[PDB]
Design an enzyme around this catalytic site. Structure first.
Site, PDB file in Angstrom:
ATOM      1  N   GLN A   1       0.747  -1.315  -0.050  1.00 43.51           N
ATOM      2  CA  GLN A   1       0.012  -0.107   0.146  1.00 43.51           C
ATOM      3  C   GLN A   1       0.833   1.366  -0.085  1.00 43.51           C
ATOM      4  OE1 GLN A   1      -2.378   0.927   3.654  1.00 43.51           O
ATOM      5  NE2 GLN A   1      -3.856   1.397   2.269  1.00 43.51           N
TER       6      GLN A   1
ATOM      7  N   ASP B   1       2.413   1.944  -3.219  1.00 45.65           N
ATOM      8  CA  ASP B   1       1.257   2.085  -4.204  1.00 45.65           C
ATOM      9  C   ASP B   1       0.899   3.422  -4.024  1.00 45.65           C
ATOM     10  OD1 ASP B   1      -2.050   2.788  -4.057  1.00 45.65           O
ATOM     11  OD2 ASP B   1      -1.899   0.813  -5.045  1.00 45.65           O
TER      12      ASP B   1
ATOM     13  N   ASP C   1       3.025   5.892  -3.009  1.00 51.79           N
ATOM     14  CA  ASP C   1       3.871   6.663  -3.633  1.00 51.79           C
ATOM     15  C   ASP C   1       3.776   6.861  -5.282  1.00 51.79           C
ATOM     16  OD1 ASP C   1       6.567   7.576  -4.713  1.00 51.79           O
ATOM     17  OD2 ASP C   1       7.570   6.493  -2.849  1.00 51.79           O
TER      18      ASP C   1
ATOM     19  N   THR D   1       3.750  11.604  -8.248  1.00 52.25           N
ATOM     20  CA  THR D   1       4.940  11.394  -9.101  1.00 52.25           C
ATOM     21  C   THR D   1       4.994   9.849  -9.513  1.00 52.25           C
ATOM     22  OG1 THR D   1       6.710  11.088  -7.568  1.00 52.25           O
ATOM     23  CG2 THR D   1       6.236  13.495  -8.240  1.00 52.25           C
TER      24      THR D   1
ATOM     25  N   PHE E   1       7.509   8.353 -10.411  1.00 49.17           N
ATOM     26  CA  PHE E   1       8.712   8.009  -9.613  1.00 49.17           C
ATOM     27  C   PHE E   1       8.633   7.535  -8.169  1.00 49.17           C
ATOM     28  CE2 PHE E   1      10.642   9.684 -13.556  1.00 49.17           C
ATOM     29  CZ  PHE E   1      10.023  10.816 -13.660  1.00 49.17           C
TER      30      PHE E   1
ATOM     31  N   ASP F   1       9.694   7.680  -5.299  1.00 54.05           N
ATOM     32  CA  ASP F   1      10.764   8.875  -4.757  1.00 54.05           C
ATOM     33  C   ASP F   1      10.167   9.120  -3.371  1.00 54.05           C
ATOM     34  OD1 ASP F   1       8.297  10.165  -5.098  1.00 54.05           O
ATOM     35  OD2 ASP F   1       8.837  11.157  -6.924  1.00 54.05           O
TER      36      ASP F   1
ATOM     37  N   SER G   1       7.472  10.431  -2.516  1.00 53.22           N
ATOM     38  CA  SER G   1       6.452  11.565  -2.590  1.00 53.22           C
ATOM     39  C   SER G   1       5.631  11.279  -1.737  1.00 53.22           C
ATOM     40  CB  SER G   1       5.853  11.549  -3.957  1.00 53.22           C
ATOM     41  OG  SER G   1       5.554  10.370  -4.656  1.00 53.22           O
TER      42      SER G   1
ATOM     43  N   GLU H   1      -5.724   6.517   6.371  1.00 48.90           N
ATOM     44  CA  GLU H   1      -6.992   5.777   6.143  1.00 48.90           C
ATOM     45  C   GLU H   1      -7.278   4.480   6.782  1.00 48.90           C
ATOM     46  OE1 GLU H   1      -6.182   2.534   4.289  1.00 48.90           O
ATOM     47  OE2 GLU H   1      -8.445   1.883   3.821  1.00 48.90           O
TER      48      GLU H   1
ATOM     49  N   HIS I   1      -5.530  -5.640  -2.155  1.00 49.23           N
ATOM     50  CA  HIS I   1      -6.796  -5.709  -1.348  1.00 49.23           C
ATOM     51  C   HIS I   1      -7.328  -7.049  -0.873  1.00 49.23           C
ATOM     52  CE1 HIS I   1      -7.911  -1.868  -3.620  1.00 49.23           C
ATOM     53  NE2 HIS I   1      -7.156  -1.574  -2.477  1.00 49.23           N
TER      54      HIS I   1
HETATM   55  C1  HEM Z   1      -6.533  -1.998   4.856  1.00 50.09           C
HETATM   56  C2  HEM Z   1      -5.786  -1.733   3.866  1.00 50.09           C
HETATM   57  C3  HEM Z   1      -6.585  -1.097   2.627  1.00 50.09           C
HETATM   58  C4  HEM Z   1      -7.509  -0.251   2.645  1.00 50.09           C
HETATM   59  C5  HEM Z   1      -8.508   0.112   3.642  1.00 50.09           C
HETATM   60  C6  HEM Z   1      -7.649   0.311   1.123  1.00 50.09           C
HETATM   61  C7  HEM Z   1      -8.465   1.331   0.652  1.00 50.09           C
HETATM   62  C8  HEM Z   1      -8.643   1.734  -0.579  1.00 50.09           C
HETATM   63  C9  HEM Z   1      -9.490   2.444  -0.898  1.00 50.09           C
HETATM   64  C10 HEM Z   1     -10.846   3.206  -0.156  1.00 50.09           C
HETATM   65  C11 HEM Z   1      -9.300   3.122  -2.210  1.00 50.09           C
HETATM   66  C12 HEM Z   1      -9.763   4.013  -3.261  1.00 50.09           C
HETATM   67  C13 HEM Z   1     -10.847   3.542  -4.025  1.00 50.09           C
HETATM   68  C14 HEM Z   1     -11.529   4.251  -5.272  1.00 50.09           C
HETATM   69  O1  HEM Z   1     -11.840   5.219  -5.088  1.00 50.09           O
HETATM   70  O2  HEM Z   1     -11.358   3.675  -6.644  1.00 50.09           O
HETATM   71  C15 HEM Z   1      -7.921   2.158  -2.559  1.00 50.09           C
HETATM   72  C16 HEM Z   1      -7.256   2.133  -3.692  1.00 50.09           C
HETATM   73  C17 HEM Z   1      -6.186   1.687  -3.834  1.00 50.09           C
HETATM   74  N1  HEM Z   1      -5.468   0.841  -3.200  1.00 50.09           N
HETATM   75 FE1  HEM Z   1      -6.139   0.207  -1.325  1.00 50.09          FE
HETATM   76  N2  HEM Z   1      -6.661  -0.225   0.425  1.00 50.09           N
HETATM   77  C18 HEM Z   1      -5.871  -0.921   1.492  1.00 50.09           C
HETATM   78  C19 HEM Z   1      -4.795  -1.653   0.896  1.00 50.09           C
HETATM   79  C20 HEM Z   1      -4.177  -1.494  -0.309  1.00 50.09           C
HETATM   80  C21 HEM Z   1      -2.948  -2.384  -0.445  1.00 50.09           C
HETATM   81  C22 HEM Z   1      -2.334  -3.538   0.362  1.00 50.09           C
HETATM   82  C23 HEM Z   1      -2.466  -2.103  -1.855  1.00 50.09           C
HETATM   83  C24 HEM Z   1      -1.179  -2.713  -2.764  1.00 50.09           C
HETATM   84  C25 HEM Z   1      -0.498  -3.804  -2.526  1.00 50.09           C
HETATM   85  C26 HEM Z   1      -3.569  -1.360  -2.307  1.00 50.09           C
HETATM   86  C27 HEM Z   1      -3.316  -0.744  -3.518  1.00 50.09           C
HETATM   87  C28 HEM Z   1      -4.485   0.283  -3.815  1.00 50.09           C
HETATM   88  C29 HEM Z   1      -4.447   0.928  -5.327  1.00 50.09           C
HETATM   89  C30 HEM Z   1      -3.346   0.820  -6.423  1.00 50.09           C
HETATM   90  C31 HEM Z   1      -5.373   1.917  -5.163  1.00 50.09           C
HETATM   91  C32 HEM Z   1      -5.702   2.512  -6.388  1.00 50.09           C
HETATM   92  C33 HEM Z   1      -5.249   4.134  -6.259  1.00 50.09           C
HETATM   93  C34 HEM Z   1      -5.348   5.323  -7.310  1.00 50.09           C
HETATM   94  O3  HEM Z   1      -6.140   6.208  -7.171  1.00 50.09           O
HETATM   95  O4  HEM Z   1      -4.372   5.481  -8.424  1.00 50.09           O
HETATM   96  N3  HEM Z   1      -4.412  -1.102  -1.214  1.00 50.09           N
HETATM   97  N4  HEM Z   1      -7.855   1.606  -1.474  1.00 50.09           N
HETATM   98  C1  LIG Z   2      -7.909   8.563   2.720  1.00 55.68           C
HETATM   99  C2  LIG Z   2      -8.778   8.553   1.581  1.00 55.68           C
HETATM  100  O1  LIG Z   2      -8.868   9.257   0.738  1.00 55.68           O
HETATM  101  N1  LIG Z   2      -9.231   7.261   1.546  1.00 55.68           N
HETATM  102  C3  LIG Z   2      -8.128   6.301   0.844  1.00 55.68           C
HETATM  103  C4  LIG Z   2      -8.113   6.128  -0.673  1.00 55.68           C
HETATM  104  C5  LIG Z   2      -7.145   5.288  -1.191  1.00 55.68           C
HETATM  105  C6  LIG Z   2      -6.634   4.371  -0.160  1.00 55.68           C
HETATM  106  O2  LIG Z   2      -5.834   3.626  -0.843  1.00 55.68           O
HETATM  107  C7  LIG Z   2      -6.724   4.453   1.174  1.00 55.68           C
HETATM  108  C8  LIG Z   2      -7.484   5.282   1.774  1.00 55.68           C
HETATM  109 CA   LIG Z   3       6.029   9.101  -6.411  1.00 55.47          CA
END
Ligand code: HEM
Ligand SMILES: CC(=O)Nc1ccc(O)cc1
Ligand SMILES: [Ca+2]
Ligand SMILES: *[C@@H]1O[C@H](CO)[C@@H](O[C@@H]2O[C@H](CO)[C@@H](O[C@H]3O[C@H](CO)[C@@H](O)[C@H](O)[C@@H]3O)[C@H](O)[C@H]2NC(C)=O)[C@H](O)[C@H]1NC(C)=O
Ligand SMILES: *[C@@H]1O[C@H](CO)[C@@H](O[C@@H]2O[C@H](CO)[C@@H](O)[C@H](O)[C@H]2NC(C)=O)[C@H](O)[C@H]1NC(C)=O
Ligand SMILES: *[C@@H]1O[C@H](CO)[C@@H](O)[C@H](O)[C@H]1NC(C)=O
Ligand SMILES: *[C@@H]1O[C@H](CO)[C@@H](O)[C@H](O)[C@H]1NC(C)=O
EC number: 1.11.1.7
Length: 595
Positions: A105, A108, A110, A184, A186, A188, A190, A258, A351
């Site tokens: 996460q 991700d 970054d 970004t 990268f 990095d 960020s 979050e 996820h």
């Molecule tokens: C308890 C842990 C986590 C919670 C509660 C969580 C929650 C969220 C939420 C609410 C979103 C945005 C949904 C949307 O509006 O489309 C999101 C996006 C995302 N999550 Fe998670 N997430 C968690 C863990 C992770 C993990 C472990 C990874 C990677 C190994 C991950 C990768 C992503 C990615 C790539 C996005 C898309 C971000 C973007 O907008 O570019 N997440 N997550």
């Molecule tokens: C803080 C917030 O906007 N919610 C949130 C969005 C994406 C993510 O991966 C974790 C939490």
């Molecule tokens: Ca970055």
């Protein structure tokens, strides 16, 4: 055909040539094309976007319009029939620490962030979508299907607002809609320092010439620092407990608060920067503030890059690691370092690695307190459980001693996320991350499952029997065919995560390929990659070679018992050792004698 660029958002382009440091926005990394990889630009398209109207409307918008001759199933139904499961027993990954999931996460965040569009400052349309579930403009509600329990206790839908896109923010139509990446591309750090000069500066401690990052002045973790508070209303961290009244943290990245463990990881990173500014001062009393900040920044970015590529990616990709990410050959200024739109979905595999509980452990790695284990949903935007209930050490122990959830075809996403997710300004712990991933995939105009199989050089099943063979699972294939009626329509997020895991890794072949390319590209295309000739000195590079996540914990908490390999399942006291038997980061090669 294809005129080279809409560019109303990123207008300013001024690059100091000599610079030894990355910019905050990511600009100027690539000298031939300076805006490649900078935040606030469109996500890259590896394949043309696919919209219901071929321009902006997502599939599933107009009822009568089909995709390849079929209706696309509702996001929530696909969620209920395939993603959910009840029994949290035996779901744990016997061989990946909970740190594994958490690092994913972190990395991700970054790399990418495609935040919702904002035409909702002093608006009703925020509630028109919530209150009455009416689709239109940026409101694209996730409707519940006929047999859904949430129907009985939550209304007709789950609100959802389309992701931000470049030139305009409400209307535009001539070229296909491209979503914005607000961070970004990268790797990095960020997420620690920010991707905007406004935030980057605010995060800094500009009260003294020590190049330190601002820390919390109202709360301390037994001497150690906490991330500053984000004094902004309405705060969702205060909403989940109006008595504790503890705000969300302020980090380089918006999402830091979050869930409690991400907040924790962000805390370690902030501490490491400061610790780095102080040791550099001792060795270089003459270096000014900026220099200290930048030289510390630069070191932390390398750290994140080493742990991710040396420790993390090999255990995500396993056998596929080499096929996509062969040993570093140096900076190739011809490579596109931008994060692709599809990557932001492919990385969501993480996820299915999130477990339903989180624990706090004492110095003997035993239950800290009478409520040491807490359900995952009680920790969304929870900063008080850190501030008013033990600092981060107890949590960092849980991250080391506990296991991630192993992805499983019959048990994909825990209900803590699938039925109890909390979203800011919405008031209930009743959202579905799986449904949102699906809706989002359509919102971004993502090509179907087979277009991507084709992109990666893999077979494109066209029948039930076809899909069973690929998924190596009859029942899942049947459920998916019943819902999608063609593998051509299966949303890439779910189709990619349904594939069995490659040997030694934690994702299927489709994802291995998608993740593989992206990481290969952000590495080869980065002018400031730590191992790239000329970025660090030959000697500094041998010192960096020694970082370990273990060391980071020892240097930034009050833990002295840690494993040697942080990402693998580790049990106390056997797999644990004393921090002293752990390689430190020798900073001598940063001393600069010029007289
Ligand atoms: C308890 C842990 C986590 C919670 C509660 C969580 C929650 C969220 C939420 C609410 C979103 C945005 C949904 C949307 O509006 O489309 C999101 C996006 C995302 N999550 Fe998670 N997430 C968690 C863990 C992770 C993990 C472990 C990874 C990677 C190994 C991950 C990768 C992503 C990615 C790539 C996005 C898309 C971000 C973007 O907008 O570019 N997440 N997550
Ligand atoms: C803080 C917030 O906007 N919610 C949130 C969005 C994406 C993510 O991966 C974790 C939490
Ligand atoms: Ca970055
Ligand atoms: C909201 O946050 C509140 C503020 O922290 C929290 O109350 C605190 O948490 C518990 C609840 O009673 C108490 O801690 C318990 O453990 C200590 C051990 O030292 C003992 O004093 C008692 O056994 C105690 O119950 C804190 O004392 C308590 N503090 C206050 C001022 O109430 C709430 O529980 C949180 N509420 C929600 C809904 O999350
Ligand atoms: C910025 O850094 C300064 C200088 O280190 C901080 O002020 C100090 O904080 C310490 C606690 O570590 C106090 O004992 C003193 O008030 C200050 N000491 C010195 C030596 O200057 C300040 O808190 C930081 N400001 C922010 C917003 O983080
Ligand atoms: C666990 O994973 C590691 C890779 O991170 C590997 O070395 C090992 O084979 C696995 N161990 C067990 C006991 O399955
Ligand atoms: C540089 O990048 C381009 C595009 O990816 C590729 O064709 C070329 O082989 C690369 N050269 C080297 C030496 O990496």
């Amino acid at each position: 055909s294809w005129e080279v660029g809409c560019g109303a958002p990123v207008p300013l382009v001024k690059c100091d040539e000599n610079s030894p440091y990355r910019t905050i926005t990511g600009d100027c990394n690539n000298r031939r094309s300076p805006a490649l990889g900078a935040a606030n630009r469109a996500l890259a398209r590896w394949l043309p976007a696919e919209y219901e109207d071929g321009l902006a409307l997502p599939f599933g918008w107009t009822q009568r319009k089909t995709r390849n001759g079929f209706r696309v199933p509702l996001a929530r139904e696909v969620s209920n029939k395939i993603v959910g499961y009840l029994d949290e027993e035996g779901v744990l990954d016997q061989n990946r620490s909970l740190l594994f999931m958490q690092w994913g996460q972190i990395v991700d965040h970054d790399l990418d962030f495609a935040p919702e569009t904002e035409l909702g400052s002093n608006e009703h349309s925020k509630t028109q979508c919530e209150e009455y579930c009416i689709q239109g403009d940026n409101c694209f509600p996730i409707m519940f299907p006929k047999n859904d329990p949430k129907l009985k206790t939550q209304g007709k839908c789950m609100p959802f607002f389309r992701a931000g896109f470049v030139c305009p923010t409400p209307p535009y139509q001539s070229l296909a809609r491209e979503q914005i990446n607000a961070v970004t591309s990268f790797l990095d750090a960020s997420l620690v320092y920010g991707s905007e000069p406004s935030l980057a500066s605010r995060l800094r401690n500009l009260s003294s010439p020590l190049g330190l990052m601002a820390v919390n002045q109202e709360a301390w973790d037994h001497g150690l620092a906490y991330l500053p508070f984000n004094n902004k209303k309405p705060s969702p961290c205060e909403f989940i407990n109006t008595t504790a009244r503890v705000p969300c943290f302020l980090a380089g990245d918006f999402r830091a608060s979050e869930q409690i463990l991400l907040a924790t990881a962000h805390t370690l990173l902030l501490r490491e920067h400061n610790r780095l500014a102080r040791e550099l001062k001792k060795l270089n009393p003459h270096w000014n503030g900026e220099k200290l900040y930048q030289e510390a920044r630069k070191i932390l970015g390398a750290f994140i890059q080493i742990i991710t590529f040396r420790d993390y990616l090999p255990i995500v990709l396993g056998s596929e690691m080499q096929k996509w990410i062969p040993p570093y050959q140096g900076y190739n200024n011809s490579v596109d370092p931008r994060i692709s739109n599809v990557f932001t979905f492919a990385f969501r595999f993480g996820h299915m690695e999130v477990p339903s509980t989180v624990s706090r452990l004492d110095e003997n790695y035993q239950p800290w307190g009478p409520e040491a284990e807490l359900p995952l949903h009680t920790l969304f935007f929870n900063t008080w459980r850190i501030i008013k209930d033990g600092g981060i050490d107890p949590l960092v122990r849980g991250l080391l001693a506990k296991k991630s959830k192993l992805m499983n075809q019959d048990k994909m996403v825990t209900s803590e996320l699938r039925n109890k997710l909390f979203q800011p300004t919405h008031k209930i712990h009743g959202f579905d991350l799986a449904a949102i991933n699906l809706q989002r995939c359509r919102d971004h105009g993502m090509p179907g499952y087979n277009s991507w199989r084709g992109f990666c050089g893999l077979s494109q099943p066209k029948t039930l029997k076809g899909l069973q063979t690929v998924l190596k699972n009859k029942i899942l294939a049947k459920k998916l065919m019943d819902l999608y009626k063609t593998p051509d329509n299966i949303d890439i997020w779910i189709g990619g995560n349904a594939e069995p895991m490659v040997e030694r890794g934690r994702v299927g072949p489709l994802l291995a390929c998608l993740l593989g390319r992206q990481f290969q590209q952000i590495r080869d295309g980065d002018r400031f990659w730590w191992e790239n000739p000329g970025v660090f000195t030959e000697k500094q590079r041998d010192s960096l070679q020694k970082v370990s996540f273990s060391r980071l914990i020892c240097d930034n908490t009050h833990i002295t018992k840690v494993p040697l390999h942080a990402f693998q399942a580790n049990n106390y006291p056997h797999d644990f050792v004393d921090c002293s038997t752990v390689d430190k980061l020798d900073l001598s090669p940063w001393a600069s004698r010029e007289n």
